Amino acid sequence: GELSKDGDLIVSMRILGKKRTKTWHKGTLIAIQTVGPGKKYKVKFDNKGKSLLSGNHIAYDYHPPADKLYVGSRVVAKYKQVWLYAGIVAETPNVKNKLRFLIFFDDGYASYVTQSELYPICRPLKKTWEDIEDISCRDFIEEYVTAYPNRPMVLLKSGQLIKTEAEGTWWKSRVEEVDGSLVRILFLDDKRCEWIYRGSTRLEPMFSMK
Amino acid sequence: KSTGGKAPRK
C-alpha cells in the first residue's frame, strides 16, 4: 500500500515532524504507506533521525495564508528557550490583538504568535482536540472551541490584586500587563510571571463569576 | 516549562 502522493502530500516535500520529545523538527517526507486503518508518513529529519508518523504528527513547512486558519485549527507554533510545539488556534488576527494568533498549546501554555511563527498540521483530526494527550487540556479545548464565540472574560487592569490558582493553591497575585485576551500575572510569594487567558477560571474573578 | 494550564488543577 505504498504511495508517491496523498493529495498535496508528495514524497520529496519539505515537512515538519513531531518527535517523542513532543517538539517538532524539519525534515523530508521520504515515503507514504497505508498501514491498517490509515496512512503513515516516513520523515527523514534534517539534524538527526527518522520516524514513521501519522498525518496529525506532520506539518507543512510553510506559514498559512492568514484567512486559512480559524478558531480550532490544529497548528505547530513557536513556543518562546525556543521550540516548535503543537497547539490550537484560539483567536485569529484582529485590531484588539494587534493582528496575532492566540495559541493554546497542548501542554496548557498560551501565547500570541505572528503569522510567520505557525505552521498548519497536515491531516488534523476532524475534532481537532481529540489528539491532545493531556486530558484536562483536551477537555478545555473541546469546551472552548464548541462555545466559541461566546467567551466570558474578566476586565482586569494593571496594578489590580487578585488570587490566581496554580498547582491546587490560590495565590496572592498582581496584574502586571493586559495584552488582548491575555493578562500577565505576577505571583507575589515567589515573584514569577505567567500569561493567562482572561476567560480562565484560574483567575479568581472568573472562577467566582461561575 | 512552568505552565498552570487553562483550568484549575483537580
Residue numbers in the entry:
A (entry chain A): 190 to 269, 273 to 402
B (entry chain B): 9 to 18
Publication excerpt:
We further solved the structures of the W358A mutant in complex with H3K9me3/K14ac or H3K9me2/K14ac peptides. In the W358A–H3K9me2/K14ac structure, electron density for the K9me2 residue did not permit confident placement of the dimethylated lysine, suggesting that it is partially disordered. In contrast, the mutation of W358 in TD3 (W358A), an aromatic cage residue of TD3, led to a loss of H3K9me1/K14ac binding and a strong reduction in binding of H3K9me2/K14ac, while binding of H3K9me3/K14ac was only moderately reduced in the peptide array binding. In the ITC peptide-binding experiments, similar results were obtained; the affinity to H3K9me2/K14ac was reduced 18-fold and binding to H3K9me1/K14ac was completely lost, but H3K9me3/K14ac binding was reduced only mildly (2-fold). The weaker binding of H3K9me1/2/K14ac to W358A could be explained by the loss of the H-bond between the W358 side chain and the carbonyl-oxygen of S10, leading to a general reduction in peptide binding.
